[PDB]
């Protein structure tokens, strides 16, 4: 289903950005 | 086709061929056109049509041969493109089809009209205004026929005309914006026939199948769809043609006319300018509320759909200090009606909630509105929707799904003085998390969104109670029922949501959940479940942080066994590598236990290569490299810590620095690298600088391509690469300039 693929992509993007926010906090950025 | 097609064609064109020979061959020709692609059939299309037209011709005495040939034309239209291109061949084909629509035999009559429908759907541009009145006369008469299969073709024709002319209207609108002539120009057949179309369609709305059935498709339903497509196609033009019918028959003693009135009105609600439709809805509201309580089951069904369509398309009218109270009052009672009615009532509430929320005042320092126009009715409407859920007939008309969708939407789009009722009803919904999961497809995403929404806005202790229910339902689910692949994935994504919101407070549930997390990581056969389980570990790493330590031994074991398994889909590998970074970032020095094997895994994965030709594998290599870089980054930062000085623990990664920088250098030399990879490379370089000091600068400066990769990153379009490449350049500049005395 097309609805399940977009549901999958949206979660991965969110997890990837939250990861970036956590690492950049340790790096002390922005 | 070596010899076959010519043999068939000859057996039709031959004057000595019997009635049987011609008829049986055209049917054989017809099915062949449904089979092969235009690769073989476009050469033969010149010969296939010769036989097809020969069977349809006015001069052919047998109606059986005509029907066989007319059906064969329908299947051959996929590749008559070149023949439709030349006007003389078009003039011949059209005349034959049009003359076939006048055949005394009904079977041929219907098939000939089927052709006009499909030809209209495929070759609108080749229809000149010349053919305008000719096609109008045939299709309008088809509509007015007593034979239903004849009527359906006349209605479908214009529905297809509407589809084509709507796309052309869109085509023309964007051409105007851009300052261009439209590529193709509409001939506006629908606009010109609207005068005559509407009276027929409104009258066809009166021929409902009293013995109702949803699988059956008849002229009455087609008419409704046609008027709807005419409304969106012709916009404001349709209004004066449909309105006098509506106003005259809205209170007709005959239910069939009364039903037609509510339908017609509902059909014209999109297309015409909302500024016309709003006062009309306001005018029709008292009568609309009456039609909800109509004795006829059919009228109620259409009334609910009309009201439900008003709420979606024209929200400002649905909210009304005058009619809102009696509107909400009749919608409540409509939830106790048959699933035909109640489902549209659910749809009406969901749109009303969104409408009332959007309209509500929100202080320009506050998050949510304090009150909104549904507050008075909130508790009552949210209770009756839950009772609608408990209805044992909820399967039919998809009432149960409509009720939950509403309940969630209402709870999401709510004011602050509704929060006690929000909290109470969302507890109930989460109690039934299993059957909501095992239940269209957006329902699961909307469930995760609402749960996310509620937890944030309610008081913290109430969010903890909701979390307790969600996990109580999920832990019972896994332990009781078998475990479907689609169900488990949705259950893991549900856990992801709660974890992302709860953070470190999720530690309550970590004990009871770890086995079922393990089942997800062990699921090699269904990798989507696996990927979700892998994703959750990362979420848990950010949530629990160093509190995940006593759960790492097992998780790390499962993740390493997963990598060692040769039959796991390639998608899983890079995600596990990324999550190794999340673990190292969370547990800090505790990672030393796993360090050796992880570094050895990353080293092997970094050196992996695919061939240049494979476009898919090159995209995969970059996804794998990105995860490799992320992993190292999490490891370097994780062992470094967030203190004044660097923790001596990073010196265990020191022997790997040469390899890491070579890996980055090799990435820089590859022209086919991605912005995400460049960003992750630049990120790692900066991390190495902060951990190991000036030595990194020297090793970077000795690999000149890395300088180029950083330059490329700071100039890149994306925000990720821009930020990280600037940071590494700054960090490299600090090492360049350290120990230098400043002077005024």
The full DSSP string for B294-352 is: -SSHHHHHHHHHHHHHHHHH-HHHHS-TTTHHHHHHHHHHHTTS-HHHHHHHHHHHHHH
Tokens coding B504:
């470190």
For B594, the token pair is: 């796993």
Q: In chain B, which residues have their Cβ closer than 8 Å to the Cβ of A1? A: 441
Partner-chain contact A22 B727, CB within 8 Å: no
Q: Is B503 left (phi over 0), alpha (psi -120 to 50) or beta?
A: left
Q: Does A5 touch chain B (CB under 8 A)?
A: no
Give the max Cα distance, chain B. 112
The rounded distance, in Å, linking the Cα atoms of B342 and B348 is 10
Contact B581, B635 (CB under 8 A): yes
Half-sphere exposure of B646 toward its Cβ, with a 13 Å CA cutoff? 19
What tokens does B743 get? 């002077």
Sign of the alpha-carbon torsion through B467, B469, B474, B479: positive
Which residue in B74, B72, B137 sits closest to B102, CA to CA?
A: B137
Decide if B157 contacts B224 (C-beta within 8 A): no
CA pseudo-torsion sign B127, B130, B131, B136 = positive
Task: Kindly state the tokens that stand for B740.
Answer: 């230098």
**Segments in B335-481 forming alpha helices (H):** 339-359, 375-389, 399-412, 419-431, 433-437, 442-457, 460-480
Gap between the Cα atoms of B551 and B241, Å rounded? 71
What is the rounded distance in angstroms from the CA atom of residue B345 to the CA atom of residue B194?
Answer: 32
Distance of CA B431 to the CA centre of its chain: 28
Which residues lie closer than 8 Å to B626 by C-beta, 6 or more apart? B574, B674, B676, B677, B680
CA atoms within 13 A on the CB side of B216: 11
Compute CA B740 distance to the chain's CA centroid, rounded to the nearest angstrom.
Answer: 59
Question: Is residue B582 less than 8 Å (CB to CB) from chain A?
Answer: yes
Tell me how far apart the alpha carbons of residues B663 and B602 are, in angstroms, rounded to a whole number. Answer: 11
CA atoms within 13 A on the CB side of B703: 21
Task: Specify the DSSP class assigned to residue B641.
Answer: -
Q: DSSP H helical segments within B509-571, as ranges?
A: 510-522, 527-544, 549-564
Q: Which residues have CB under 8 Å from B517's CB, separation 6+?
A: B533, B536, B537, B555
d(CA B346, CA B354): 13
Interface test with B, best of A2, A7, A21 (most B CBs within 10 A): A7
SS3 B433: helix
What gap in Å lies between CA B220 and CA B143, rounded to an integer? 11
Domain of A27 in residue numbering reads as 1-30
A11 part of contact set with chain B, CB < 8 Å: yes
Query: B359-387 burial by CB neighbour count: b if 16+ within 10 A, else e?
Result: ebeeeeeeebbeebbbbebbeebbebbbe
Cβ–Cβ < 8 Å for B97, B152: no
Rounded to the nearest angstrom, the gap between the alpha carbon of residue B244 and the centroid of all alpha carbons in its chain is 38
Q: Distance between CA atoms of B259 and B263, rounded to whole angstroms?
A: 6
CATH number of the structural domain B1-744: 1.25.10.10
State whether B585 and A22 contact (CB < 8 Å): yes
B578 interfaces chain A, CB cutoff of 8 Å: yes
Whose structure tokens read 């889909």?
A: B569
On the 0-12 / 13-18 / 19+ scale of CB atoms within 10 A, B104 is exposed
Q: Which two tokens stand for residue B424?
A: 């109470």
Put simply, whether A9 touches B (Cβ < 8 Å) is: no
Q: Which of B386, B419, B425, B381 is nearest to B404 (CA)?
A: B386
B250 phi, psi to nearest 5 deg: -65, -20
How many whole angstroms separate alpha carbon B165 and alpha carbon B85?
Answer: 20
First-last CA distance in chain A = 39
- Which candidate, B418, B438, B422, B550, places its Cα nearest to that of B494? B438
- Which candidate from A3, A18, A27 shows the least CB-CB separation from B441? A3
Q: How many CA atoms lie within 13 A of B62 on its CB side?
A: 16
Cα dihedral: B465, B469, B471, B477 (round 10): 180
B674-677 contacts, C-beta under 8 A, 24 or more apart: B674/B622, B674/B626, B675/B713, B675/B716, B675/B717, B675/B718, B675/B720, B675/B721, B676/B622, B676/B626, B676/B718, B676/B720, B676/B721, B677/B622, B677/B625, B677/B626, B677/B629
Q: Which residues neighbour B364 within 8 Å (Cβ) at sequence distance 6 or greater?
A: none
Q: Give the torsion through C-alpha atoms of B165, B171, B174, B179, to 10 deg.
A: -110
DSSP state of B218: -
- Rg, Å, chain B Cα set: 34
Half-sphere exposure (Cβ direction) of B406: Cα atoms closer than 13 Å: 31
Residue B578 CA to residue B182 CA, distance in Å, equals 49
Mutate to test the interface with A, among B630, B676, B726 (most CBs of A within 10 A): B630
B422: its two tokens: 């929000």
Is B225 exposed, middle or buried, given 0-12, 13-18 or 19+ CB atoms closer than 10 A? middle
**Burial of B705 from C-beta contacts in 10 A (0-12 / 13-18 / 19+):** middle
The number of domains in chain A is 1
Return the sign of the alpha-carbon dihedral for residues B563, B568, B574, B576.
negative
Put simply, the answer to whether B445 touches A3 (Cβ < 8 Å) is yes
What is the C-alpha separation between B73 and A12, in angstroms, rounded?
50
- Chain A nearest C-alpha distance from B37 (Å): 27
- With tokens 């044992």, the residue in question is B392
User: In B, which residues are within 8 Å of A22 by CB distance?
Assistant: 542, 585
Cα gap B134→B94, rounded to integer Å: 10
Nearest chain B Cα to A17, which residue? Answer: B720
Q: Provide the 3-class DSSP secondary structure of residue A29.
A: coil
Under 8 Å between Cβ of B692 and B699: no
Question: Are B241 and B194 spatial neighbours (Cβ–Cβ below 8 Å)?
Answer: yes
At residue B734's C-alpha, the angle toward residues B730 and B738, to 5°, is: 170
In sequence order, the 6+-apart residues with CB closer than 8 A to the CB of B410 are B349, B350, B353, B374, B378, B381, B382, B385
Distance from C-alpha of B728 to C-alpha of B685, rounded to nearest angstrom = 6
Residues B98, A5: Cα–Cα separation, whole Å? 47
- Asked if residue B715 lies in contact with residue B706, where contact means CB atoms within 8 angstroms, the answer is no
**Domain residue spans of chain B:** 1-744
Measured in residues, chain A has a length of: 30
Chain A to chain B, count of Cβ pairs less than 8 Å apart? 54
- CB < 8 Å to B639, chain A: none
**Any B CB within 8 A of A23 CB:** yes
Helix (H) or strand (E) holding B219: helix B219-234
Beta strands of B84-217 (E only): which ranges? none
Reduced to 3 states (helix: H, G, I; strand: E, B; else coil), residue B32 is helix
SS3 assignment, position B610: coil
Residue B15, CA distances (Å) to B5, B54, B188, B341 in order: 18, 11, 44, 62
What is the rounded CA–CA span in Å between residue B140 and residue B634?
71
Among candidate residues B670, B671, B672, B688, the one with its CA nearest the CA of residue B724: B688
| Closest by Cα among B670, B664, B702 to B683 | B664
How many alpha carbons fall within 13 Å on the CB side of residue B476?
Answer: 12
Query: Looking at chain B from residue 665 to 694, which residues have their Cβ under 8 Å from any Cβ of chain A?
Result: 683, 686-687, 690
| Whole-number Å distance between alpha carbons of B736 and B744 | 20
Q: How far apart are the first and last CA of chain B?
A: 90
Residues of A in contact with B539 (CB under 8 A): 15, 18
**Inter-chain residue contact A23 with B723, CB threshold 8 Å:** no
List the one residue out of B497, B143, B429, B275 whose CA is nearest residue A14.
B497
Q: Which of B387, B446, B392, B450 is nearest to B422 (CA)?
A: B450
Q: What is the CA angle B66-B68-B71, rounded to 5?
A: 105
Token output for B368: 């949510």
Separation of alpha carbons B319 and A19, rounded Å: 43
B164: left (phi over 0), alpha (psi -120 to 50) or beta: alpha
Give the gyration radius of chain A's Cα atoms. Answer: 13
CA angle B357/B359/B363 to nearest 5° reads 85
Nearest CB partner across the interface for A30, out of B441, B486, B723? B723
The SS3 assignment for B565 reads coil
* Nearest-angstrom CA–CA distance, B539 and B542: 5
Token output for B235: 């916009």
DSSP at B16: T
Instruction: Flag if A7 and B445 touch (Cβ within 8 Å).
Output: yes
Nearest CA in chain B to A10: B445
Task: Give kind and range of the element (H or E) at residue B696.
Answer: helix B694-701
Helix count and strand count (H, E) for chain B: 36, 0
Across the interface, whether the CB atoms of B442 and A3 are under 8 A apart is answered: yes
Nearest CB partner across the interface for A22, out of B445, B542, B687: B542
What experimental approach yielded this model? Answer: X-ray
């Amino acid at each position: 289903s097309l609805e399940q693929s977009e549901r999958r992509r949206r979660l991965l993007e969110l997890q990837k950005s939250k990861r970036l926010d956590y690492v950049n906090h340790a790096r002390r950025l922005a | 086709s070596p010899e076959l097609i010519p043999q068939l064609v000859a057996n039709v064109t031959n004057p000595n061929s019997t009635e049987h020979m011609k008829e049986s061959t055209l049917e054989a020709i017809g099915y062949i056109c449904q089979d092969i692609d235009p690769e073989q059939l476009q050469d033969k299309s010149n010969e296939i049509l010769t036989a097809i037209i020969q069977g349809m011709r006015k001069e052919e005495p047998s109606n059986n041969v005509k029907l066989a040939a007319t059906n064969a034309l329908l299947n051959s239209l996929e590749f008559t493109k070149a023949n439709f291109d030349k006007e003389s061949e078009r003039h011949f084909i059209m005349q034959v089809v049009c003359e076939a629509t006048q055949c005394p035999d009904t079977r041929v009559r219907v098939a000939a009209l089927q052709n006009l429908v499909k030809i209209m759907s495929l070759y609108y541009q080749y229809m000149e205004t010349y053919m305008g009145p000719a096609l109008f006369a045939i299709t309008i008469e088809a509509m007015k026929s007593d034979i239903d299969e004849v009527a359906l073709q006349g209605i479908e024709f214009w529905s297809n005309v509407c589809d084509e002319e709507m796309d052309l209207a869109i085509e023309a609108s964007e051409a105007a914006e851009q300052g261009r002539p439209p590529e193709h120009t509409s001939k506006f057949y629908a606009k010109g026939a609207l005068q005559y179309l509407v009276p027929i369609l409104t009258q066809t709305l009166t021929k409902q199948d009293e013995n109702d059935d949803d699988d059956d498709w008849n002229p009455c339903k087609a008419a409704g769809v046609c008027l709807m497509l005419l409304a969106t196609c012709c916009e404001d033009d349709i209004v004066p043609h449909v309105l006098p019918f509506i106003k005259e028959h809205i209170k007709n003693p005959d239910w069939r006319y009364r039903d037609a009135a509510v339908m017609a009105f509902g059909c014209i609600l999109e297309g015409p300018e909302p500024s016309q439709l709003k006062p009309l809805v306001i005018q029709a509201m008292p009568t609309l509320i009456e039609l909800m309580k109509d004795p006829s089951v059919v009228v109620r069904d259409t009334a609910a759909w009309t009201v439900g369509r008003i709420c979606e398309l024209l929200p400002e009218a649905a909210i009304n200090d005058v009619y809102l109270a009696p509107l909400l009052q009749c919608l409540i009672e409509g939830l106790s009606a048959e699933p035909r009615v109640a489902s549209n009532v659910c749809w009406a509430f969901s749109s009303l909630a969104e409408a009332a929320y959007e309209a509500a005042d929100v202080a320009d320092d506050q998050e949510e509105p304090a009150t909104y126009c549904l507050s008075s009715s909130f508790e009552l409407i949210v209770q009756k929707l839950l009772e609608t859920t408990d209805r044992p007939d909820g399967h039919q008309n998809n009432l149960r799904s409509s009720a939950y969708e509403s309940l969630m939407e209402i709870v999401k789009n709510s004011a602050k003085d509704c929060y006690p009722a929000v909290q109470k009803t969302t507890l109930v919904i989460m109690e039934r998390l299993q059957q909501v999961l095992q239940m269209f497809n957006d329902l699961q995403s909307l469930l995760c969104a609402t749960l996310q929404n509620v937890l944030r806005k309610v008081q913290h202790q109430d969010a903890l109670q909701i979390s307790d229910v969600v996990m109580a339902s999920l832990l019972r689910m896994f332990q009781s029922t078998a475990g479907s692949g689609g169900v488990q994935e949705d259950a893991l994504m549900a856990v992801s949501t709660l974890v992302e919101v709860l953070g470190g407070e999720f530690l309550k549930y970590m004990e009871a959940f770890k086995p079922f997390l393990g089942i997800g990581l062990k699921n090699y056969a269904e990798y989507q479940v696996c990927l979700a389980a892998v994703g959750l570990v990362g979420d848990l790493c950010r949530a629990l942080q160093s509190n995940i330590i006593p759960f790492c031994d097992e998780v790390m074991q499962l993740l390493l066994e997963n990598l060692g398994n040769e039959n796991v889909h390639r998608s899983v590998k890079p995600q596990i590598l990324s999550v190794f970074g999340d673990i190292a970032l969370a547990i800090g020095g505790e990672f030393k236990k796993y360090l050796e094997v992880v570094l050895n895994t990353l080293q092997q994965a970094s050196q992996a290569q695919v061939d240049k030709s494979d476009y898919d594998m090159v995209d995969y290599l970059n996804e794998l490299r990105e995860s490799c870089l992320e992993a190292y980054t999490g490891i370097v930062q994780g062992l470094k810590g967030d203190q004044e000085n660097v923790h001596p623990d990073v010196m265990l990664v020191q022997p790997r620095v040469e390899f890491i920088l070579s890996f980055i250098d090799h990435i820089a030399g590859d022209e086919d690298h991605t912005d995400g990879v460049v960003a992750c490379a630049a990120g790692l370089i900066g991390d190495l600088c902060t951990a190991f000091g000036k030595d990194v600068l020297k090793l970077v400066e000795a690999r000149p391509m890395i300088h180029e990769l950083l330059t490329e990153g700071r100039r890149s379009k994306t925000n990720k690469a821009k930020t990280l490449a600037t940071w590494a350049t700054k960090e490299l500049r600090k090492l360049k300039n350290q120990g230098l005395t400043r002077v005024d």
